Structure 1
Amino acid sequence: NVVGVHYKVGRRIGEGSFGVIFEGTNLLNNQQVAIKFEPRRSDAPQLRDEYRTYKLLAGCTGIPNVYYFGQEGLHNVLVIDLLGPSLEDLLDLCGRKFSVKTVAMAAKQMLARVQSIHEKSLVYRDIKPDNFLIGRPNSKNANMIYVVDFGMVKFYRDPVTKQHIPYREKKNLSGTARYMSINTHLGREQSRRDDLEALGHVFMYFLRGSLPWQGLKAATNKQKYERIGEKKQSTPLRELCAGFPEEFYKYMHYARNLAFDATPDYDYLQGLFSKVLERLNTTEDENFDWNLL
């Protein structure tokens, strides 16, 4: 039908670790939006709490604008800017893997996004390539990479005092295997380091086309997070980053080694990719592999 008083829904463009997303269209300007629906029940990670996060990060580079949030019957709606394909499809579309260049350039923006968030006293806690999108196909941001879905973001520090909160090693465990940090796997709580670490498992996913721990038999589901973690653990960073820019190794080695409160030297990490682009004689122009088709 039509919700958000002046936003009409279109087709389904996918779902996210939370709940379906349809691509609407504001009925008062003709601009294509993103509409997220969510039922009102046991769940309450409410687009609201996500809305509030889309609010906070609002104004920080590569963060989608928020446009609405209400209560339409059995649901909760959150209106958001439309955006291009996810880095995950792109990968698939670009031929199961990207090229050092493309990676290096993505890493920067990505890594930039995971910082902004951290500077808002929030761990992102759900780092996967499926969460990074590019501006709409033919616009002024097509060559930009955004972050989406903050359904798992948490406060790792009082946004005010910036005083870091606790450090357990005993709660739940309900994320996305393939890229989480080893800490995460071990039960440890997640700090800004866990975000940077999984980001590198993701950069190596791009380069390698896969990680060494994907696919694991003998288990089920609440156990797979084990076999995967183990392999991750029994997989040396040399072997993993083997045959790829040293910076990448340098990156992973850094991340996989920070303390639970360690404030990442974001500039150091950003510099590593800039060099990677310096060796290639290229520049941070957006010749991603995905603008040729």
Structure 2
Amino acid sequence: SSVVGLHYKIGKKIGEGSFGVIFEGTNIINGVPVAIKFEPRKTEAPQLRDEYRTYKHLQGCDGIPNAYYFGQEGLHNILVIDLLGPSLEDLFDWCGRRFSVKTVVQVAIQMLTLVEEVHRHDLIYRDIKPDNFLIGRRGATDENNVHLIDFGMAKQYRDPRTKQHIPYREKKSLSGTARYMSINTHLGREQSRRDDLEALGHVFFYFLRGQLPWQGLKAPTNKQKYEKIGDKKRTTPAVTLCDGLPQQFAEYLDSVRSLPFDAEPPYEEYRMLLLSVLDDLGQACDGDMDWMHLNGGRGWDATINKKPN
């Protein structure tokens, strides 16, 4: 049958890189579009169910899609959430692999708020990358707001009742994305709130510069390449990353790298710090984003942009 979870008609495939295939779909009661993820039920790393629980735990958070359904059908488990738009990596690419200072500040404070809400719900994200932050759909009220998906790497960092932080430990696996992950992650250290925010700082410099200086490194093995990347991170001062850029971005990176393991980050201080960039430059925080000017003011286009995607 073409309909799963009673109410969701399967449409075209829209990717498969995480655990399972992802499809578009439509709610056959109201026509609202959805994203549908399939996980093979006979898998040794069951993950979809825990992701449904994470979405349900974050229900009501701005920028976190609703999960409408989870169930088993045939040989698959199925999860259904809101359908969103292109990722920030997509939009970055279509804007020529550089975002303006204003667009970086504006997405940064939204990304800080998203990660803050994750943290307030006792979770760390552990897979920060521009590919997992998505905008909305064309014409929607949240068309150009930033959203966060893919919680397969998320983990509880504190007991929900007592707020007791997990213990520090080392010899952790190097799971994550080497371009953005924190220095602590390279060193096999248990991640905490500070590591999500340091990865954000790397993403901010990536958007501003167009590249990070630890891209393009060579080594015979993935393990040795990750190590060289971590080495480069440890030997590149934030003011060097920030050459010719507003120094608030260096101050942010140094700050979150200095956070104690169990410390609560001052999220609003960080947001005010980056907002002061716009004051310095005489700009307004008015929601105008680089990608809104693509294609003559029309916005991103499926055959000009998303087809090279």
Shorter-chain TM range is over 0.9
Alignment of 1:81-96 (within 5 A): 81-96=82-97
Moved more, 188-197 or 131-140: 131-140
Equivalent-residue separation in structure 2 for 1:245 and 1:164 (angstroms) = 34
- Matched residue, 2:247: 246
Change beyond 3 A, Cα 1:243–1:141: same
- Matched residue, 1:170: 171
Q: Which of structure 1's runs of 4+ aligned residues deviate more than 4 A? A: none
Q: Structure 1 regions of 5+ residues with no counterpart?
A: none
Equivalent-residue separation in structure 1 for 2:206 and 2:158 (angstroms) = 30
Amino acid at match of 2:160: P
- Matched residue, 2:303: none
Matched, 1:191 2:197: no
1:102-153 deviations in Å (ceiling 9; x for gaps): 0000000000000001011111101000000111121101121110011111
The CA deviation at 1:74 is: 1.6
Matched, 1:156 2:195: no
Partner SS for 1:276:
helix
The CA deviation at 1:16 is: 4.2
Equivalent-residue separation in structure 1 for 2:12 and 2:263 (angstroms) = 44
Equivalent-residue separation in structure 2 for 1:17 and 1:231 (angstroms) = 28
- TM superposition score normalised by structure 2: 0.92
The alignment covers a number of residue pairs equal to: 293
- Matched residue, 2:100: 99
Amino acid at match of 1:20: V
1:199-232 deviations in Å (ceiling 9; x for gaps): 0000001001111111221322233211111111
- Matched residue, 1:219: 220
Equivalent-residue separation in structure 2 for 1:36 and 1:274 (angstroms) = 37
Alignment of 1:60-209 (within 5 A): 60-209=61-210
Aligned alpha-carbon RMSD (Å): 1.2
Q: Please say if residues 239 and 247 of structure 2, whose CA atoms lie closer than 8 Å, have aligned partners that are also in contact.
A: no
1:7-37 deviations in Å (ceiling 9; x for gaps): 1111111234323211111111111111111
- TM superposition score normalised by structure 1: 0.97
Q: Structure 2 regions of 5+ residues with no counterpart?
A: 295-309
Q: Please say if residues 16 and 149 of structure 1, whose CA atoms lie closer than 8 Å, have aligned partners that are also in contact.
A: no
Amino acid at match of 1:87: L
Change beyond 3 A, Cα 1:39–1:104: same
Change beyond 3 A, Cα 1:104–1:45: farther
Alignment of 1:16-55 (within 5 A): 16-55=17-56
Moved more, 93-102 or 211-220: 211-220
Amino acid at match of 2:254: H
Change beyond 3 A, Cα 1:119–1:69: same
- Matched residue, 1:283: 284
Equivalent-residue separation in structure 1 for 2:37 and 2:135 (angstroms) = 18
Partner SS for 1:159:
coil
Equivalent-residue separation in structure 1 for 2:208 and 2:149 (angstroms) = 22
Q: Please say if residues 45 and 151 of structure 1, whose CA atoms lie closer than 8 Å, have aligned partners that are also in contact.
A: no
